[PDB]
Design an enzyme around this catalytic site. Structure first.
Site, PDB file in Angstrom:
ATOM      1  N   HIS B  41       5.383 -11.680  -6.190  1.00 21.44           N
ATOM      2  CA  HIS B  41       5.651 -10.471  -5.416  1.00 21.44           C
ATOM      3  C   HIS B  41       5.733 -10.749  -3.912  1.00 21.44           C
ATOM      4  O   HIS B  41       6.084  -9.835  -3.158  1.00 21.44           O
ATOM      5  CB  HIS B  41       4.650  -9.330  -5.744  1.00 21.44           C
ATOM      6  CG  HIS B  41       3.205  -9.622  -5.449  1.00 21.44           C
ATOM      7  ND1 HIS B  41       2.710  -9.726  -4.166  1.00 21.44           N
ATOM      8  CD2 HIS B  41       2.134  -9.741  -6.275  1.00 21.44           C
ATOM      9  CE1 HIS B  41       1.405  -9.954  -4.214  1.00 21.44           C
ATOM     10  NE2 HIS B  41       1.031  -9.975  -5.482  1.00 21.44           N
ATOM     11  N   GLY B 142      -4.300  -8.894   1.273  1.00 21.43           N
ATOM     12  CA  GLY B 142      -3.963 -10.261   1.602  1.00 21.43           C
ATOM     13  C   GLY B 142      -4.641 -11.313   0.754  1.00 21.43           C
ATOM     14  O   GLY B 142      -4.370 -12.505   0.945  1.00 21.43           O
ATOM     15  N   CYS B 144      -4.071 -11.870  -2.381  1.00 18.39           N
ATOM     16  CA  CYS B 144      -3.244 -12.314  -3.489  1.00 18.39           C
ATOM     17  C   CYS B 144      -2.950 -13.796  -3.356  1.00 18.39           C
ATOM     18  O   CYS B 144      -2.760 -14.300  -2.246  1.00 18.39           O
ATOM     19  CB  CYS B 144      -1.940 -11.538  -3.517  1.00 18.39           C
ATOM     20  SG  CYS B 144      -2.171  -9.790  -3.518  1.00 18.39           S
TER      21      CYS B 144
HETATM   22  C1  LIG Z   1       4.021  -5.740  -4.856  1.00 20.11           C
HETATM   23  C2  LIG Z   1       2.844  -5.213  -5.693  1.00 20.11           C
HETATM   24  C3  LIG Z   1       2.796  -5.992  -7.009  1.00 20.11           C
HETATM   25  C4  LIG Z   1       3.069  -3.726  -5.948  1.00 20.11           C
HETATM   26  C5  LIG Z   1       1.524  -5.423  -4.876  1.00 20.11           C
HETATM   27  C6  LIG Z   1       1.319  -4.676  -3.723  1.00 20.11           C
HETATM   28  C7  LIG Z   1       0.147  -4.857  -2.964  1.00 20.11           C
HETATM   29  C8  LIG Z   1      -0.816  -5.784  -3.365  1.00 20.11           C
HETATM   30  N1  LIG Z   1      -2.034  -5.929  -2.502  1.00 20.11           N
HETATM   31  C9  LIG Z   1      -2.101  -6.857  -1.353  1.00 20.11           C
HETATM   32  O1  LIG Z   1      -3.083  -6.887  -0.700  1.00 20.11           O
HETATM   33  C10 LIG Z   1      -0.959  -7.818  -0.967  1.00 20.11           C
HETATM   34  C11 LIG Z   1       0.357  -7.783  -1.374  1.00 20.11           C
HETATM   35  N2  LIG Z   1       0.979  -8.789  -0.790  1.00 20.11           N
HETATM   36  C12 LIG Z   1       0.099  -9.436  -0.031  1.00 20.11           C
HETATM   37  N3  LIG Z   1      -1.096  -8.832  -0.137  1.00 20.11           N
HETATM   38  C13 LIG Z   1      -3.169  -5.046  -2.726  1.00 20.11           C
HETATM   39  C14 LIG Z   1      -2.873  -4.189  -3.971  1.00 20.11           C
HETATM   40  O2  LIG Z   1      -3.061  -4.661  -5.040  1.00 20.11           O
HETATM   41  N4  LIG Z   1      -2.345  -2.791  -3.932  1.00 20.11           N
HETATM   42  C15 LIG Z   1      -2.144  -2.132  -5.225  1.00 20.11           C
HETATM   43  C16 LIG Z   1      -1.795  -0.661  -5.030  1.00 20.11           C
HETATM   44  C17 LIG Z   1      -1.744   0.068  -6.381  1.00 20.11           C
HETATM   45  C18 LIG Z   1      -0.988  -0.705  -7.422  1.00 20.11           C
HETATM   46  C19 LIG Z   1      -0.175  -1.836  -6.826  1.00 20.11           C
HETATM   47  C20 LIG Z   1      -1.037  -2.838  -6.033  1.00 20.11           C
HETATM   48  C21 LIG Z   1      -4.483  -5.753  -3.006  1.00 20.11           C
HETATM   49  C22 LIG Z   1      -5.620  -5.252  -2.446  1.00 20.11           C
HETATM   50  C23 LIG Z   1      -6.823  -5.862  -2.688  1.00 20.11           C
HETATM   51  C24 LIG Z   1      -6.877  -6.977  -3.513  1.00 20.11           C
HETATM   52  N5  LIG Z   1      -5.748  -7.449  -4.079  1.00 20.11           N
HETATM   53  C25 LIG Z   1      -4.565  -6.853  -3.830  1.00 20.11           C
HETATM   54  C26 LIG Z   1      -0.619  -6.538  -4.527  1.00 20.11           C
HETATM   55  C27 LIG Z   1       0.560  -6.356  -5.281  1.00 20.11           C
END
Ligand SMILES: CC(C)(C)c1ccc(N(C(=O)c2c[nH]cn2)[C@@H](C(=O)NC2CCCCC2)c2cccnc2)cc1
Ligand SMILES: CC(C)(C)c1ccc(N(C(=O)c2c[nH]cn2)[C@@H](C(=O)NC2CCCCC2)c2cccnc2)cc1
Lengths: 302, 300
Positions: B41, B142, B144
């Site tokens: 992603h 961040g 991920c």
């Molecule tokens: C693109 C996709 C798959 C929708 C996504 C978006 C954001 C992230 N999250 C990044 O922090 C992040 C993204 N890119 C760099 N960092 C955060 C995250 O999960 N929000 C979620 C919101 C609800 C469902 C989708 C994901 C996150 C926070 C804390 C710990 N883990 C991850 C993960 C995945």
């Protein structure tokens, strides 16, 4: 999201661990520059009775030492007493010595334990210094000399060297100046730790983290003044609260002020009514405000 | 004495973390040999709406990646898709690559999380894969690409790369082959995790650790057979006991049979929280037999 007790990455400390053996006693030491630091009970003969460490050091035979970093063997140049530690001057400098300091921690403060055996790091976990100057560790025989540390902006702050286990299983160390936490003796005589009071400021930090993570069933509509809570706390195994300006932003982010949490603590100190808060079924005081803020928001208060 | 959730020393894995940036996305990758592995992603545009990862990859410009180990930036020479991951070929070998393997863990298994931000490790802690294929992590934005792994005789066994967080706060990742644990999608969606349950085999391990540490106030004076417990378990939020062989070593040291511990679990469940065990919630399911044996006896 989430709240976990966690350690800072151990890499920079791992390269400082050595095995220190004298006769049949073997434990762990810290190799920094051209010095190896370890608990002085490595030169104790037997585990009882009272040890005259000065006499033992006076009849020491330097070649009876075996100090090694992996299969790098360090020659001993000299040995002097440093409180409950030995300062061993060795013939080689640890070229992987990090930038470091010593600091003596106070009750309620967190730090990382690098549990070591046979001169090698084996595990890492976070601890919090209790009011009776013990820590809730996990150590088995051979772990003496395991270091406790924090890492701040690339500087390793060393604050603990593991010394002994009390009959109850709680763990006692010294600071790196050789001063035993809590004044416990590094002797096999009977000694017992004092009662433990929950560090209330840390319990408050935990409840704020709970709110931030959507746990609110326990929250009280009441509220209790700091002064009145402190009167209750000293009769109920918790510390008094000194001032609430470290809860400033936490109070803003959640909308809940310290007085409301203090009333919540009072109800939760009995039992959790069959419920849980972030998996806990009793109040925990192992998380500081600094840890909570770092895990919620990635801000490192200085 | 004592019992703590421990991570293994993280030094050998710290040297494998890199920062991976593409467009407005920045996360962490794992640099092994001449390849960097990270969640795919990182090439999604924003988080507002669904994207076609194959299309995204088909129009990608290699020089739009910025990949760094510390202040050392790596040249990107190729990228292919690996499930929910990217395999990025770079122009330098990581000379600090450890001996390593991949393995996909099963529910109830423990591993270490190295929590990373901006391409550098920030914290390390142990976790345990839940029955709904989530872990109870501590992560913020961040994280991920943070790796999960075990270390056995100097070989690093990578089992997890952090992918996303769900509404309830639980954490979802993929194995290093790109297969998402639990089948969750690496998409912005309304998905929710399946029902959680306490992993009974781990509660048994924990109760043996308690006995080894001299904690016995909770020990039932009676027994219950496994089949009868399993009927009760599925109606009381606990998993069934399928494999009993793993407790032979602990029964051989405590002289307490599993049937007695099962009856103790039922009684602990009926007064849940009335007393701690070793300073833990009485039905703690984060410790495996392997962890308990290592901490009580040092045995690998
Ligand atoms: C693109 C996709 C798959 C929708 C996504 C978006 C954001 C992230 N999250 C990044 O922090 C992040 C993204 N890119 C760099 N960092 C955060 C995250 O999960 N929000 C979620 C919101 C609800 C469902 C989708 C994901 C996150 C926070 C804390 C710990 N883990 C991850 C993960 C995945
Ligand atoms: C000489 C002296 C001060 C009495 C002593 C003796 C043994 C040790 N213990 C070493 O394991 C050890 C000894 N030498 C290398 N390791 C263990 C220990 O404290 N039992 C205690 C028994 C009651 C009173 C003495 C200390 C230990 C076990 C688990 C975790 N922590 C430490 C520590 C200190």
């Amino acid at each position: 999201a989430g709240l976990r007790k966690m350690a800072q990455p151990s890499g920079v400390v791992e390269k400082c661990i050595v095995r220190v053996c004298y006769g049949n006693m073997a434990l762990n030491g810290l190799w920094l520059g051209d010095t190896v630091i370890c608990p002085r009970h490595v030169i104790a003969s037997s585990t009882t009775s009272t040890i005259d460490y000065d006499y033992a050091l006076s009849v020491l035979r330097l070649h009876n030492f075996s100090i090694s970093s992996g299969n790098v063997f360090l020659g001993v140049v000299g040995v002097t007493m440093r409180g409950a530690l030995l300062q061993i001057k060795v013939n080689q400098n640890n070229v992987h010595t990090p930038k470091y300091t010593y600091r003596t921690v106070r009750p309620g403060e967190s730090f990382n334990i690098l549990a070591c055996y046979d001169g090698s790091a084996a595990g890492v976990y976070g601890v919090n210094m209790r009011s009776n100057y013990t820590i809730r560790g996990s150590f088995i025989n051979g772990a003496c000399g395991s270091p406790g540390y924090n890492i701040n902006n690339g500087t390793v702050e060393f604050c603990y060297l593991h010394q002994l286990e009390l009959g109850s299983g709680c763990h006692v160390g010294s600071d790196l100046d050789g001063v035993m936490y809590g004044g416990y003796e590094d002797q096999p005589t009977l000694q017992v730790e004092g009662a433990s009071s929950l560090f209330t400021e840390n319990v408050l930090a935990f409840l704020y983290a709970a709110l931030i993570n959507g746990s609110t069933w326990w929250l009280s509509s009441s509220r209790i003044a700091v002064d009145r809570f402190n009167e209750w706390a000293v009769h109920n195994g918790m510390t008094t609260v000194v001032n609430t300006d470290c809860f400033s932003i936490l109070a803003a982010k959640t909308g809940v002020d310290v007085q409301r949490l203090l009333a919540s603590i009072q109800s939760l100190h009995k039992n959790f009514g069959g419920k849980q808060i972030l998996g806990y079924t009793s109040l925990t005081d192992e998380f500081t405000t600094g840890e909570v803020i770092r895990q919620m928001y990635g801000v490192n208060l200085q």
